Amino acid sequence: ARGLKKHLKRLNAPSHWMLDKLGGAFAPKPSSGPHKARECLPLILILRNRLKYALTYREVQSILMQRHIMVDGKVRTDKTYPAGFMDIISIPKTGENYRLLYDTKGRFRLHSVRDEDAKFKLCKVRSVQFGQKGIPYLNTYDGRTIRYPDPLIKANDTIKLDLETNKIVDFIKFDVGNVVMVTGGRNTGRVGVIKNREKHKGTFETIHVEDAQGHQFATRLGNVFTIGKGTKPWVSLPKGKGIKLTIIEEQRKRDAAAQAA
Amino acid sequence: AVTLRTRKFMTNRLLSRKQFVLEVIHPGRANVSKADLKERLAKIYEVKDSNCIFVFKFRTHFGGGKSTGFGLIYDNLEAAKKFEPKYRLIRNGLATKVEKSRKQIKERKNRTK
Amino acid sequence: MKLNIANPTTGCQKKVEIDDDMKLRNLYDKRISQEVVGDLLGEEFEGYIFKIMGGCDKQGFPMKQGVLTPGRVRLLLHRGTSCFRGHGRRVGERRRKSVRGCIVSQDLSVINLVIVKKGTPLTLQRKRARIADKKKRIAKKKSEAAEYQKL
RNA sequence: UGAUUCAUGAUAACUCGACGGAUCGCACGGCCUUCGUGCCGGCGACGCAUCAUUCAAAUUUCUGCCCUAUCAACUUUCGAUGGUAGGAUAGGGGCCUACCAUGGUGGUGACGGGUGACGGAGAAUUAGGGUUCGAUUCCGGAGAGGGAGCCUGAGAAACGGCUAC
RNA sequence: GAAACUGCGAAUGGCUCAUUAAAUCAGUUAUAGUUUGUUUGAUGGUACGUGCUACUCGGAUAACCGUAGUAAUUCUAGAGCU
Ligand SMILES: [Mg+2]
Ligand SMILES: [Mg+2]
Ligand SMILES: [Mg+2]
Ligand SMILES: [Mg+2]
Ligand SMILES: [Mg+2]
Ligand SMILES: [Mg+2]
Ligand SMILES: [Mg+2]
Ligand SMILES: [Mg+2]
Ligand SMILES: [Mg+2]
Ligand SMILES: [Mg+2]
């Protein structure tokens, strides 16, 4: 190709969008933004698909041009805007607030939060280093660059960021013994506790994690995102508290729930 | 005797209306016309104006005596004019239509000045 | 063979005809923008000094300055200049066009010549807004560099 | 950082510096110093430069491809393999130039030839193992009658752009 | 508000499978070997003043108006404005 591609064909769209294969030839093609477009959830799907607030393409545009939807504290009128993990979507007109979090099956879910727990987010640091005139600054994994961080915050750690003041308010030091929610691979959605980290010089670091219900698993460093200090997490969990289960467990769940109805 | 029975029904303040699935039952009838559906719906939802009501995508289930479709109740005439497509308003009688002819629709206008 | 006459100093223009040999000896073998004495064009032109610049020929090809040959050259010339004014033509586009040379000769049809000689509050608010932001940028600096300085 | 003369800072100079807002919308609304659109001051639009991010590309490592030996040597002066210094490029690199060395591939099939050969995801038949197919809607590549050269632009060697044959 | 200048886009999409057999391509790497309009976050002094808190405002072109050429074309020349 002689340049950038602007269409996303529906069969090539991410599998966790759950777009149906006969519903057209194209998919929304998330615009560039603070998330990598293969791990984001555009606003078209948040409004039209999940929340069923709109029935068509153009209805979503009619919603956005009216400045209702607010993403992480600012009003975003772009229709394919790449909202992502741990963002907040707010509709003040309905006074309703959602944190984007994973479910155990690896798909984004809009977990309702309160207005208290919507003025802040958590963000993992990509790196820390100096800038022009010796000023230190840190990178997040969603584009944000903060200058003059606490000189302790190192790479791969977590920070709490108030949306009002837009500065840090606390942080978690990435290390063994903290709760972490996996954001990639087959284990995405599963929360757990860091039990082991094994280094490998020249390759990816691997993390070994143990769920609260005992199930043990592992991932690589880039796919782990600490939530809280100690066993208690700092943010709300969705319908399942990040606990993966076998297919037989949910078969039992359906049939056992089929006797009360 | 026809009945009306709406489901999956939710009021949104973003587009200032309420959406629902109509599941009219008409034992003995062929099907319910959308105008009569409009009228009947007005007197369960008391709309003061039977022009903000829209119905579409009706199926008439195999075997008869049952029809489903989608229903929109607005709260203004203004909201229905901004939040509804033109052809739907034309169907409800709030607008008028035009046509096209594609040669010289732009082609020879390109080339004079 | 024909000549469009105009004067900007008043704003007039009209075209006239000549087919006399000796009437056009000092018309030929001379270039665009070259001053020509009106004495040869006739007795009706003394005091007038004519400035010849432009005027196409048969087939409607103009002249270009700098092609010193009464020929029909083929130049690859950029869009927007004289003799090529292509519209709907993709900035960066060039054409090889046919044009006649600068030196007036017999092969030309019509000459164009002229007559050298006849015989607020808003802006101020915007400016002070920009200034009031330039100041608070360094206000923010001295605030934010120092909160980190004492640590 | 697995790893850097790293990030980054100081210093001495340099450049005929791409740059560092002469722009546009509604809203009004505190208060006099000439009480003078008066001192202000907001919410936005567009635009300049740097870093990071995102959208990507370009090069790139390892392993893997059908038939043919009635195709056993092939490449190398003229770049073939490597070295040094350059030039060019967005950048690595014989990419190209100068000089120097004599290498490099090959019965584990090089080089050549055929392909009615774009590659893959896949398709048909399938006890198992297999055999054959894959122009075609998804991914990657390539082309726009055949070659070649370009301008514009962040991005094209573009063809519903240009120039030449 | 038409037209017109300015900006942007037209390098995506669509079609085809000719050339191409370590080539493309697939899984897997690398950039400490680079470019990246745009999105998003952060950021921005000194232009000369002998650095002692800023120092003035250009001409010219379309749309228009008008005289033409050529058999001809979003082929084209000259003049008056802004
Ligand atoms: Mg294409
Ligand atoms: Mg898009
Ligand atoms: Mg060398
Ligand atoms: Mg070199
Ligand atoms: Mg072929
Ligand atoms: Mg074929
Ligand atoms: Mg294709
Ligand atoms: Mg091409
Ligand atoms: Mg053909
Ligand atoms: Mg071409």
PDB file of all heavy atoms in Angstrom, chain C residues 12-42:
ATOM      1  N   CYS C  12      -9.834  51.914 -20.948  1.00  0.00           N
ATOM      2  CA  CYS C  12     -10.516  51.728 -22.221  1.00  0.00           C
ATOM      3  C   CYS C  12      -9.862  50.600 -23.006  1.00  0.00           C
ATOM      4  O   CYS C  12      -8.696  50.272 -22.780  1.00  0.00           O
ATOM      5  CB  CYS C  12     -10.512  53.023 -23.050  1.00  0.00           C
ATOM      6  SG  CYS C  12     -10.290  54.552 -22.093  1.00  0.00           S
ATOM      7  N   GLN C  13     -10.628  49.989 -23.914  1.00  0.00           N
ATOM      8  CA  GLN C  13     -10.095  48.910 -24.735  1.00  0.00           C
ATOM      9  C   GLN C  13     -11.036  48.628 -25.900  1.00  0.00           C
ATOM     10  O   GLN C  13     -12.254  48.770 -25.781  1.00  0.00           O
ATOM     11  CB  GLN C  13      -9.850  47.666 -23.880  1.00  0.00           C
ATOM     12  CG  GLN C  13     -11.083  47.006 -23.298  1.00  0.00           C
ATOM     13  CD  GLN C  13     -10.724  45.793 -22.464  1.00  0.00           C
ATOM     14  OE1 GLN C  13     -10.278  44.778 -22.994  1.00  0.00           O
ATOM     15  NE2 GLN C  13     -10.974  45.870 -21.168  1.00  0.00           N
ATOM     16  N   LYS C  14     -10.445  48.207 -27.018  1.00  0.00           N
ATOM     17  CA  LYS C  14     -11.060  48.134 -28.344  1.00  0.00           C
ATOM     18  C   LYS C  14     -10.037  47.485 -29.263  1.00  0.00           C
ATOM     19  O   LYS C  14      -8.849  47.502 -28.954  1.00  0.00           O
ATOM     20  CB  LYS C  14     -11.434  49.535 -28.845  1.00  0.00           C
ATOM     21  CG  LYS C  14     -11.697  49.695 -30.340  1.00  0.00           C
ATOM     22  CD  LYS C  14     -11.582  51.164 -30.719  1.00  0.00           C
ATOM     23  CE  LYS C  14     -11.841  51.428 -32.183  1.00  0.00           C
ATOM     24  NZ  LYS C  14     -11.672  52.873 -32.493  1.00  0.00           N
ATOM     25  N   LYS C  15     -10.481  46.917 -30.385  1.00  0.00           N
ATOM     26  CA  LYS C  15      -9.532  46.294 -31.303  1.00  0.00           C
ATOM     27  C   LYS C  15      -9.699  46.830 -32.720  1.00  0.00           C
ATOM     28  O   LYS C  15     -10.801  47.205 -33.127  1.00  0.00           O
ATOM     29  CB  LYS C  15      -9.664  44.776 -31.292  1.00  0.00           C
ATOM     30  CG  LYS C  15     -10.902  44.232 -31.951  1.00  0.00           C
ATOM     31  CD  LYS C  15     -10.837  42.716 -31.980  1.00  0.00           C
ATOM     32  CE  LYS C  15      -9.643  42.239 -32.778  1.00  0.00           C
ATOM     33  NZ  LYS C  15      -9.551  42.959 -34.063  1.00  0.00           N
ATOM     34  N   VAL C  16      -8.585  46.880 -33.460  1.00  0.00           N
ATOM     35  CA  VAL C  16      -8.500  47.510 -34.772  1.00  0.00           C
ATOM     36  C   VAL C  16      -7.731  46.572 -35.714  1.00  0.00           C
ATOM     37  O   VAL C  16      -7.166  45.562 -35.289  1.00  0.00           O
ATOM     38  CB  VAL C  16      -7.837  48.908 -34.685  1.00  0.00           C
ATOM     39  CG1 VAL C  16      -7.857  49.670 -36.025  1.00  0.00           C
ATOM     40  CG2 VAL C  16      -8.476  49.738 -33.582  1.00  0.00           C
ATOM     41  N   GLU C  17      -7.677  46.945 -36.999  1.00  0.00           N
ATOM     42  CA  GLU C  17      -7.163  46.127 -38.091  1.00  0.00           C
ATOM     43  C   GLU C  17      -6.118  46.879 -38.912  1.00  0.00           C
ATOM     44  O   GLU C  17      -6.272  48.074 -39.178  1.00  0.00           O
ATOM     45  CB  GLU C  17      -8.324  45.689 -39.008  1.00  0.00           C
ATOM     46  CG  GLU C  17      -8.633  44.185 -39.103  1.00  0.00           C
ATOM     47  CD  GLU C  17      -7.427  43.301 -39.395  1.00  0.00           C
ATOM     48  OE1 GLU C  17      -6.313  43.820 -39.599  1.00  0.00           O
ATOM     49  OE2 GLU C  17      -7.614  42.073 -39.509  1.00  0.00           O
ATOM     50  N   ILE C  18      -5.057  46.167 -39.315  1.00  0.00           N
ATOM     51  CA  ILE C  18      -4.076  46.656 -40.284  1.00  0.00           C
ATOM     52  C   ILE C  18      -3.598  45.507 -41.166  1.00  0.00           C
ATOM     53  O   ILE C  18      -3.381  44.387 -40.696  1.00  0.00           O
ATOM     54  CB  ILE C  18      -2.853  47.335 -39.616  1.00  0.00           C
ATOM     55  CG1 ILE C  18      -3.256  48.576 -38.823  1.00  0.00           C
ATOM     56  CG2 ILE C  18      -1.801  47.698 -40.649  1.00  0.00           C
ATOM     57  CD1 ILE C  18      -3.105  48.421 -37.352  1.00  0.00           C
ATOM     58  N   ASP C  19      -3.415  45.795 -42.461  1.00  0.00           N
ATOM     59  CA  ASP C  19      -2.826  44.837 -43.401  1.00  0.00           C
ATOM     60  C   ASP C  19      -1.847  45.516 -44.362  1.00  0.00           C
ATOM     61  O   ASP C  19      -1.762  45.161 -45.541  1.00  0.00           O
ATOM     62  CB  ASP C  19      -3.917  44.086 -44.163  1.00  0.00           C
ATOM     63  CG  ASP C  19      -4.805  45.006 -44.981  1.00  0.00           C
ATOM     64  OD1 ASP C  19      -4.556  46.231 -45.004  1.00  0.00           O
ATOM     65  OD2 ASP C  19      -5.778  44.501 -45.581  1.00  0.00           O
ATOM     66  N   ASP C  20      -1.077  46.479 -43.869  1.00  0.00           N
ATOM     67  CA  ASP C  20      -0.136  47.241 -44.682  1.00  0.00           C
ATOM     68  C   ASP C  20       1.285  46.811 -44.344  1.00  0.00           C
ATOM     69  O   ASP C  20       1.641  46.724 -43.168  1.00  0.00           O
ATOM     70  CB  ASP C  20      -0.315  48.743 -44.443  1.00  0.00           C
ATOM     71  CG  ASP C  20       0.671  49.601 -45.236  1.00  0.00           C
ATOM     72  OD1 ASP C  20       1.485  49.054 -46.007  1.00  0.00           O
ATOM     73  OD2 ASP C  20       0.613  50.840 -45.098  1.00  0.00           O
ATOM     74  N   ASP C  21       2.094  46.553 -45.377  1.00  0.00           N
ATOM     75  CA  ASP C  21       3.463  46.088 -45.159  1.00  0.00           C
ATOM     76  C   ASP C  21       4.301  47.115 -44.408  1.00  0.00           C
ATOM     77  O   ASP C  21       4.760  46.864 -43.288  1.00  0.00           O
ATOM     78  CB  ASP C  21       4.135  45.743 -46.489  1.00  0.00           C
ATOM     79  CG  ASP C  21       4.345  44.259 -46.661  1.00  0.00           C
ATOM     80  OD1 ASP C  21       4.168  43.521 -45.666  1.00  0.00           O
ATOM     81  OD2 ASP C  21       4.728  43.828 -47.769  1.00  0.00           O
ATOM     82  N   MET C  22       4.529  48.276 -45.022  1.00  0.00           N
ATOM     83  CA  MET C  22       5.390  49.278 -44.408  1.00  0.00           C
ATOM     84  C   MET C  22       4.806  49.805 -43.107  1.00  0.00           C
ATOM     85  O   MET C  22       5.547  50.361 -42.292  1.00  0.00           O
ATOM     86  CB  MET C  22       5.658  50.409 -45.408  1.00  0.00           C
ATOM     87  CG  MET C  22       4.576  51.484 -45.586  1.00  0.00           C
ATOM     88  SD  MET C  22       4.369  52.679 -44.246  1.00  0.00           S
ATOM     89  CE  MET C  22       3.480  53.973 -45.101  1.00  0.00           C
ATOM     90  N   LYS C  23       3.496  49.643 -42.898  1.00  0.00           N
ATOM     91  CA  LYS C  23       2.898  49.982 -41.615  1.00  0.00           C
ATOM     92  C   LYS C  23       3.427  49.106 -40.488  1.00  0.00           C
ATOM     93  O   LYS C  23       3.259  49.457 -39.316  1.00  0.00           O
ATOM     94  CB  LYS C  23       1.375  49.852 -41.694  1.00  0.00           C
ATOM     95  CG  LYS C  23       0.601  50.402 -40.501  1.00  0.00           C
ATOM     96  CD  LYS C  23      -0.711  51.052 -40.917  1.00  0.00           C
ATOM     97  CE  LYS C  23      -0.515  52.282 -41.767  1.00  0.00           C
ATOM     98  NZ  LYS C  23       0.214  53.354 -41.036  1.00  0.00           N
ATOM     99  N   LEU C  24       4.045  47.966 -40.807  1.00  0.00           N
ATOM    100  CA  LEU C  24       4.433  46.996 -39.790  1.00  0.00           C
ATOM    101  C   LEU C  24       5.883  46.551 -39.917  1.00  0.00           C
ATOM    102  O   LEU C  24       6.214  45.432 -39.532  1.00  0.00           O
ATOM    103  CB  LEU C  24       3.524  45.767 -39.820  1.00  0.00           C
ATOM    104  CG  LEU C  24       2.073  45.884 -40.269  1.00  0.00           C
ATOM    105  CD1 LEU C  24       1.388  44.531 -40.240  1.00  0.00           C
ATOM    106  CD2 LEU C  24       1.353  46.833 -39.354  1.00  0.00           C
ATOM    107  N   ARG C  25       6.771  47.384 -40.458  1.00  0.00           N
ATOM    108  CA  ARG C  25       8.171  46.969 -40.470  1.00  0.00           C
ATOM    109  C   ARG C  25       8.787  47.069 -39.080  1.00  0.00           C
ATOM    110  O   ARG C  25       9.481  46.146 -38.637  1.00  0.00           O
ATOM    111  CB  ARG C  25       8.974  47.778 -41.490  1.00  0.00           C
ATOM    112  CG  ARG C  25       8.507  47.555 -42.918  1.00  0.00           C
ATOM    113  CD  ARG C  25       8.213  46.079 -43.147  1.00  0.00           C
ATOM    114  NE  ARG C  25       8.126  45.719 -44.555  1.00  0.00           N
ATOM    115  CZ  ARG C  25       7.804  44.506 -44.986  1.00  0.00           C
ATOM    116  NH1 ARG C  25       7.520  43.549 -44.110  1.00  0.00           N
ATOM    117  NH2 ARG C  25       7.746  44.251 -46.287  1.00  0.00           N
ATOM    118  N   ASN C  26       8.531  48.167 -38.371  1.00  0.00           N
ATOM    119  CA  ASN C  26       8.992  48.346 -36.999  1.00  0.00           C
ATOM    120  C   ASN C  26       8.094  47.665 -35.980  1.00  0.00           C
ATOM    121  O   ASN C  26       8.314  47.838 -34.777  1.00  0.00           O
ATOM    122  CB  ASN C  26       9.114  49.837 -36.665  1.00  0.00           C
ATOM    123  CG  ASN C  26       9.730  50.634 -37.793  1.00  0.00           C
ATOM    124  OD1 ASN C  26       9.382  50.456 -38.958  1.00  0.00           O
ATOM    125  ND2 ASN C  26      10.657  51.521 -37.452  1.00  0.00           N
ATOM    126  N   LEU C  27       7.080  46.927 -36.431  1.00  0.00           N
ATOM    127  CA  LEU C  27       6.305  46.065 -35.546  1.00  0.00           C
ATOM    128  C   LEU C  27       6.954  44.694 -35.404  1.00  0.00           C
ATOM    129  O   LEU C  27       6.986  44.126 -34.310  1.00  0.00           O
ATOM    130  CB  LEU C  27       4.883  45.922 -36.079  1.00  0.00           C
ATOM    131  CG  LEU C  27       3.771  45.711 -35.059  1.00  0.00           C
ATOM    132  CD1 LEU C  27       3.745  46.871 -34.097  1.00  0.00           C
ATOM    133  CD2 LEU C  27       2.444  45.593 -35.778  1.00  0.00           C
ATOM    134  N   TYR C  28       7.478  44.160 -36.500  1.00  0.00           N
ATOM    135  CA  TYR C  28       8.104  42.851 -36.509  1.00  0.00           C
ATOM    136  C   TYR C  28       9.486  42.914 -35.864  1.00  0.00           C
ATOM    137  O   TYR C  28      10.006  43.984 -35.534  1.00  0.00           O
ATOM    138  CB  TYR C  28       8.238  42.332 -37.939  1.00  0.00           C
ATOM    139  CG  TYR C  28       6.941  42.062 -38.671  1.00  0.00           C
ATOM    140  CD1 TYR C  28       5.773  42.730 -38.344  1.00  0.00           C
ATOM    141  CD2 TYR C  28       6.885  41.106 -39.672  1.00  0.00           C
ATOM    142  CE1 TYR C  28       4.601  42.480 -39.013  1.00  0.00           C
ATOM    143  CE2 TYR C  28       5.717  40.858 -40.354  1.00  0.00           C
ATOM    144  CZ  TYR C  28       4.576  41.543 -40.016  1.00  0.00           C
ATOM    145  OH  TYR C  28       3.402  41.290 -40.681  1.00  0.00           O
ATOM    146  N   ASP C  29      10.077  41.733 -35.697  1.00  0.00           N
ATOM    147  CA  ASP C  29      11.453  41.585 -35.240  1.00  0.00           C
ATOM    148  C   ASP C  29      11.689  42.358 -33.949  1.00  0.00           C
ATOM    149  O   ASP C  29      12.736  42.974 -33.742  1.00  0.00           O
ATOM    150  CB  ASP C  29      12.434  42.020 -36.324  1.00  0.00           C
ATOM    151  CG  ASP C  29      12.926  40.857 -37.149  1.00  0.00           C
ATOM    152  OD1 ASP C  29      12.871  39.715 -36.647  1.00  0.00           O
ATOM    153  OD2 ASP C  29      13.370  41.082 -38.295  1.00  0.00           O
ATOM    154  N   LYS C  30      10.703  42.303 -33.062  1.00  0.00           N
ATOM    155  CA  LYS C  30      10.820  42.930 -31.756  1.00  0.00           C
ATOM    156  C   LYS C  30       9.945  42.156 -30.781  1.00  0.00           C
ATOM    157  O   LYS C  30       9.037  41.422 -31.177  1.00  0.00           O
ATOM    158  CB  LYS C  30      10.429  44.403 -31.806  1.00  0.00           C
ATOM    159  CG  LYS C  30       8.941  44.658 -31.817  1.00  0.00           C
ATOM    160  CD  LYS C  30       8.688  46.082 -32.256  1.00  0.00           C
ATOM    161  CE  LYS C  30       9.583  47.054 -31.504  1.00  0.00           C
ATOM    162  NZ  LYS C  30       9.896  48.298 -32.262  1.00  0.00           N
ATOM    163  N   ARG C  31      10.213  42.355 -29.497  1.00  0.00           N
ATOM    164  CA  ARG C  31       9.770  41.432 -28.469  1.00  0.00           C
ATOM    165  C   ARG C  31       8.687  42.053 -27.595  1.00  0.00           C
ATOM    166  O   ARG C  31       8.375  43.241 -27.688  1.00  0.00           O
ATOM    167  CB  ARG C  31      10.948  40.963 -27.598  1.00  0.00           C
ATOM    168  CG  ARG C  31      12.199  40.463 -28.333  1.00  0.00           C
ATOM    169  CD  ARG C  31      13.147  41.552 -28.816  1.00  0.00           C
ATOM    170  NE  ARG C  31      14.510  41.035 -28.939  1.00  0.00           N
ATOM    171  CZ  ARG C  31      15.590  41.783 -29.150  1.00  0.00           C
ATOM    172  NH1 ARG C  31      15.484  43.098 -29.271  1.00  0.00           N
ATOM    173  NH2 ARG C  31      16.782  41.212 -29.246  1.00  0.00           N
ATOM    174  N   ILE C  32       8.086  41.194 -26.767  1.00  0.00           N
ATOM    175  CA  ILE C  32       7.129  41.639 -25.762  1.00  0.00           C
ATOM    176  C   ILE C  32       7.759  42.686 -24.859  1.00  0.00           C
ATOM    177  O   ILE C  32       8.956  42.636 -24.551  1.00  0.00           O
ATOM    178  CB  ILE C  32       6.620  40.433 -24.953  1.00  0.00           C
ATOM    179  CG1 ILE C  32       5.848  39.462 -25.842  1.00  0.00           C
ATOM    180  CG2 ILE C  32       5.816  40.846 -23.733  1.00  0.00           C
ATOM    181  CD1 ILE C  32       5.645  38.112 -25.219  1.00  0.00           C
ATOM    182  N   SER C  33       6.949  43.676 -24.476  1.00  0.00           N
ATOM    183  CA  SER C  33       7.297  44.704 -23.498  1.00  0.00           C
ATOM    184  C   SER C  33       8.283  45.710 -24.071  1.00  0.00           C
ATOM    185  O   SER C  33       8.582  46.725 -23.435  1.00  0.00           O
ATOM    186  CB  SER C  33       7.868  44.077 -22.227  1.00  0.00           C
ATOM    187  OG  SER C  33       6.859  43.414 -21.497  1.00  0.00           O
ATOM    188  N   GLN C  34       8.782  45.442 -25.275  1.00  0.00           N
ATOM    189  CA  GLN C  34       9.668  46.386 -25.932  1.00  0.00           C
ATOM    190  C   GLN C  34       8.861  47.617 -26.308  1.00  0.00           C
ATOM    191  O   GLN C  34       7.756  47.506 -26.844  1.00  0.00           O
ATOM    192  CB  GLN C  34      10.303  45.756 -27.173  1.00  0.00           C
ATOM    193  CG  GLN C  34      11.810  45.989 -27.315  1.00  0.00           C
ATOM    194  CD  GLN C  34      12.183  47.158 -28.208  1.00  0.00           C
ATOM    195  OE1 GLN C  34      11.419  47.560 -29.078  1.00  0.00           O
ATOM    196  NE2 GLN C  34      13.383  47.690 -28.013  1.00  0.00           N
ATOM    197  N   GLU C  35       9.388  48.791 -25.972  1.00  0.00           N
ATOM    198  CA  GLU C  35       8.762  50.032 -26.404  1.00  0.00           C
ATOM    199  C   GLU C  35       8.770  50.116 -27.926  1.00  0.00           C
ATOM    200  O   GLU C  35       9.768  49.786 -28.574  1.00  0.00           O
ATOM    201  CB  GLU C  35       9.485  51.228 -25.771  1.00  0.00           C
ATOM    202  CG  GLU C  35      10.438  52.025 -26.678  1.00  0.00           C
ATOM    203  CD  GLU C  35      11.745  51.297 -26.985  1.00  0.00           C
ATOM    204  OE1 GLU C  35      11.928  50.145 -26.539  1.00  0.00           O
ATOM    205  OE2 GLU C  35      12.599  51.884 -27.682  1.00  0.00           O
ATOM    206  N   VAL C  36       7.638  50.510 -28.505  1.00  0.00           N
ATOM    207  CA  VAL C  36       7.550  50.763 -29.935  1.00  0.00           C
ATOM    208  C   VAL C  36       7.043  52.182 -30.148  1.00  0.00           C
ATOM    209  O   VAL C  36       6.116  52.644 -29.470  1.00  0.00           O
ATOM    210  CB  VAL C  36       6.662  49.731 -30.666  1.00  0.00           C
ATOM    211  CG1 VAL C  36       5.192  50.002 -30.446  1.00  0.00           C
ATOM    212  CG2 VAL C  36       6.979  49.732 -32.160  1.00  0.00           C
ATOM    213  N   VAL C  37       7.701  52.890 -31.059  1.00  0.00           N
ATOM    214  CA  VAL C  37       7.237  54.207 -31.459  1.00  0.00           C
ATOM    215  C   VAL C  37       5.988  54.057 -32.318  1.00  0.00           C
ATOM    216  O   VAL C  37       5.946  53.246 -33.253  1.00  0.00           O
ATOM    217  CB  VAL C  37       8.363  54.966 -32.180  1.00  0.00           C
ATOM    218  CG1 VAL C  37       8.763  54.259 -33.461  1.00  0.00           C
ATOM    219  CG2 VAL C  37       7.941  56.390 -32.476  1.00  0.00           C
ATOM    220  N   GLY C  38       4.947  54.819 -31.985  1.00  0.00           N
ATOM    221  CA  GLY C  38       3.720  54.769 -32.754  1.00  0.00           C
ATOM    222  C   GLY C  38       3.809  55.407 -34.119  1.00  0.00           C
ATOM    223  O   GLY C  38       2.877  55.273 -34.916  1.00  0.00           O
ATOM    224  N   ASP C  39       4.921  56.092 -34.400  1.00  0.00           N
ATOM    225  CA  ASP C  39       5.076  56.816 -35.657  1.00  0.00           C
ATOM    226  C   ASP C  39       4.870  55.900 -36.859  1.00  0.00           C
ATOM    227  O   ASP C  39       4.228  56.288 -37.842  1.00  0.00           O
ATOM    228  CB  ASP C  39       6.460  57.478 -35.681  1.00  0.00           C
ATOM    229  CG  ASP C  39       6.661  58.413 -36.861  1.00  0.00           C
ATOM    230  OD1 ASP C  39       6.484  57.983 -38.020  1.00  0.00           O
ATOM    231  OD2 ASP C  39       6.990  59.593 -36.618  1.00  0.00           O
ATOM    232  N   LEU C  40       5.385  54.669 -36.789  1.00  0.00           N
ATOM    233  CA  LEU C  40       5.246  53.758 -37.920  1.00  0.00           C
ATOM    234  C   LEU C  40       3.823  53.236 -38.059  1.00  0.00           C
ATOM    235  O   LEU C  40       3.309  53.117 -39.175  1.00  0.00           O
ATOM    236  CB  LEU C  40       6.216  52.590 -37.790  1.00  0.00           C
ATOM    237  CG  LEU C  40       6.060  51.670 -39.003  1.00  0.00           C
ATOM    238  CD1 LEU C  40       7.071  52.011 -40.096  1.00  0.00           C
ATOM    239  CD2 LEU C  40       6.147  50.217 -38.584  1.00  0.00           C
ATOM    240  N   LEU C  41       3.169  52.925 -36.940  1.00  0.00           N
ATOM    241  CA  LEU C  41       1.820  52.373 -37.010  1.00  0.00           C
ATOM    242  C   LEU C  41       0.888  53.311 -37.758  1.00  0.00           C
ATOM    243  O   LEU C  41      -0.124  52.873 -38.315  1.00  0.00           O
ATOM    244  CB  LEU C  41       1.291  52.114 -35.604  1.00  0.00           C
ATOM    245  CG  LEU C  41       1.032  50.670 -35.189  1.00  0.00           C
ATOM    246  CD1 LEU C  41       0.367  50.658 -33.823  1.00  0.00           C
ATOM    247  CD2 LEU C  41       0.202  49.932 -36.226  1.00  0.00           C
ATOM    248  N   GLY C  42       1.213  54.592 -37.774  1.00  0.00           N
ATOM    249  CA  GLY C  42       0.501  55.558 -38.577  1.00  0.00           C
ATOM    250  C   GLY C  42       0.831  56.953 -38.097  1.00  0.00           C
ATOM    251  O   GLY C  42       1.551  57.147 -37.118  1.00  0.00           O
TER     252      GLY C  42
END
